[PDB]
Each structure stands twice: as C-alpha cells, then as structure tokens.
C-alpha cells in the first residue's frame, strides 16, 4: 500500500516462497527496465539446478555465474565510498571495478520487451555475453597492472562492441561471439 515491505501480506508471502524478485521504484523512474533490485532479491533453487546447467548449457557456467555475482556485490561496497568522497579520488583498479560494474548493469541486466530480437534471450546467448564480459575484465586488469590509463581502457571500442552485442538475433550469434572474442584478445594486447 505504500511500497514498504512491512505490510502483513508482503511479510507473510515471504517465509513460504522460493525466489523473490523485489522491484525498485527509482530504477523504474530512470526508465531502466526491468526494475529488478539486484541486492534485495534472492533465490533458493540455485544449488539443485547446477547438474542440469552442466549437462545442458556449459561446463563452467556455475563458475561464471559466481564470478558475475561476486563482482556486482563487491562493486556495491566501493560505490559506498564513491558516494562518500567522489569517483575521482579512487585508485585505478577501483575505478575499473566501478566501470565494469556499470557495463554489466547496462549491457547484461537490461532488456526491452518491445524490441524485435531482444525479447527472448536463451541460455547460450547469456553465457556468451558473460564470457565476453569476464574476458574483457581480465585483460583490462592485466593492462592496468602494466600501467596504461583507464581512459584509454574505456575508449577501446570493444566497449561498444560488447555493449551492442545484445541486439543480435539468435542465428548469427555463434559467429559474432567468436569474432568479438578474438578481437578483444587481440586489441587488448596490441597496445
């Protein structure tokens, strides 16, 4: 009746259910749909389905999922200090984590139900996008250790490639993903 999760129905409907997909209002004002709050929700089935994932999607899909979740819910803590001080007094690795978090949040957790082909994403397509994001982050970490600057790391156009990699259809993706993967692996050691 006001959005608060303290109503008797909103509480009694916990403690009895499995997943719980808490929607947030500000994400729905920004026109960022769907407005699923990524730290108030939870799931209880994500530990009995791993055999099925290993059998029908990939072999390290559980590990990729774990890495993605860990990166999100570690970036949150840094975002606290961001809002305290400002996103310029941070180090380079910290700003890299913030920017990878934003790339994830805008290219893998966003979905417009009115597009022509970005309205039904299957498991292999999601796993492909996750693989691309993880590889980009790994190579960028290595390069930041080397010493290149985060502004160049961000101006690398593989940013926009793996960004728009979601408006593809489902037929040419097995080749699009291979091309973009090899292009990332090349362009992030070229410099």
């Amino acid at each position: 009746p006001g959005g608060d999760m303290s109503e008797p129905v909103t509480q009694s409907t916990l403690r009895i259910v499995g997943a719980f997909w808490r929607l947030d209002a500000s994400l729905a004002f920004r026109r960022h749909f769907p407005a699923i709050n990524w730290n108030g929700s939870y799931s209880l089935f994500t530990s009995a389905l791993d055999p099925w994932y290993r059998e029908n999607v990939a072999e390290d899909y559980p590990e990729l999922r774990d890495a993605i979740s860990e990166l999100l819910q570690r970036e949150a803590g840094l975002q606290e200090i961001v809002q305290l001080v400002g996103p310029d007094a941070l180090q380079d690795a910290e700003r890299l984590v913030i920017e990878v978090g934003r790339i994830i949040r805008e290219d893998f957790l966003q979905q417009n139900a009115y597009h022509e082909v970005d309205a039904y994403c299957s498991m292999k397509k999601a796993y492909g996008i996750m693989k691309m994001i993880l590889a980009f982050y790994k190579e960028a970490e290595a390069a930041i250790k080397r010493g290149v600057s985060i502004d160049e790391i961000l101006q690398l156009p593989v940013l926009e490639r793996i960004g728009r990699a979601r408006y593809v259809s489902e037929e040419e993706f097995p080749a699009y993903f291979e091309e973009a993967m090899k292009e990332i692996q090349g362009a992030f050691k070229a410099l």
């Binding site: 006001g2 959005g3 608060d4 999760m5 303290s6 606290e80 200090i81 305290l84 400002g86 310029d88 007094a89």
Partner: protein, 167 residues
C-alpha cells in the same frame, strides 16, 4: 519543505546514519597518514634550509674578493657574456587527495663560453653562485610540497568537523 514519507524510510535513515559514522571514522584514518607524511617533510625542510645558508655564506664570501680586486673587463664579460636562461619546468610527480598540481623544478645550466686564458676570481664567484642556485632550487622544490600537504590536512579536518557536527 516536507519530511519524506513516514515508514520504511526509518530503516533507510538508520542505514544512512551508519554510513555517515563509517565515513567519519575513515576520514580520521586518512588524516593520520597525512600527518605521518607531513612530519617527515617538515624534517627535510630543515636540512634544505641548512644547505641553503651554507651556500649563501660561501658565495657571499667568495664574491667580496671581486670587490677588492674589482675587474673592469671581468664585469664587462658579466655584461657581455651572460645567457638569460629559462629552466621553466612544471613537472608533476604526486597528486595526493584529488588532482593536485605539483610543481617541480630542474636546472638547465648553460656553457658560459670564455677565451683560452680566461680564469680569474670571478670564475670562482660564478661557480659559487651556481652552487647557490642548486640549493635555492632544492628549497623552492620542498616548500611547495609542504604547503600542499598542509592544505590537504586542513581540507580533511574541515570535512570531518562539518560531518560530525552538522550532518
């Protein structure tokens, strides 16, 4: 104006209070390191000024021998042969806090061409003034960094006070 809606914002306000307290007790731990560096810098400043005084006395002593043995062609070469040189370097090394422009300074010294049988007491005077310039460069290097880190101390202390008193 109007206080925000009056339920389920209580949890959010307590969360914001916890975050503000964490922020205060982190800013304190940052200021501790700022001071632990400031003291070393104010230690080095003393040695810098010491060497500057040394070179000052040296060059002032070695210059008053050009007083007694005043050389006409000597000071004419002081007018004839002299390069006005600009070692205008703005090297930046460390940016503490946010982006802070640090000013370093190096010394491009010329050649000072002179004839074959050139030397005199003015040569020792000029070399003494060169050492004097080295020491002056040292001092003007250190004092800028010292004032910068002091301003950083004052900024963080103002933030801590404003937070812990007003917010």
């Amino acid at each position: 104006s109007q206080v925000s809606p009056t339920r389920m914002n209580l949890l959010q306000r307590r969360g914001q209070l916890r975050l503000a307290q964490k922020g205060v007790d982190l800013l304190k731990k940052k200021r501790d390191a700022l001071v632990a560096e400031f003291f070393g810098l104010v230690r080095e400043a003393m040695e810098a000024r010491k060497a500057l005084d040394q070179a000052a006395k040296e060059a002032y002593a070695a210059l008053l021998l050009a007083q007694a043995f005043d050389g006409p062609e000597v000071v004419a070469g002081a007018a004839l042969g002299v390069p006005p040189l600009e070692g205008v370097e703005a090297e930046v090394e460390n940016v503490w806090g946010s982006k802070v422009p640090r000013l370093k300074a190096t010394f491009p010294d010329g050649a000072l061409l002179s004839p074959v049988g050139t030397p005199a007491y003015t040569l020792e005077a000029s070399r003494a003034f060169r050492r004097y310039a080295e020491a002056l460069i040292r001092v003007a290097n250190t004092e800028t960094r010292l004032k910068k880190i002091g301003e950083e101390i004052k900024k963080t202390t103002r933030r801590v006070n404003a937070l812990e008193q007003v917010v």
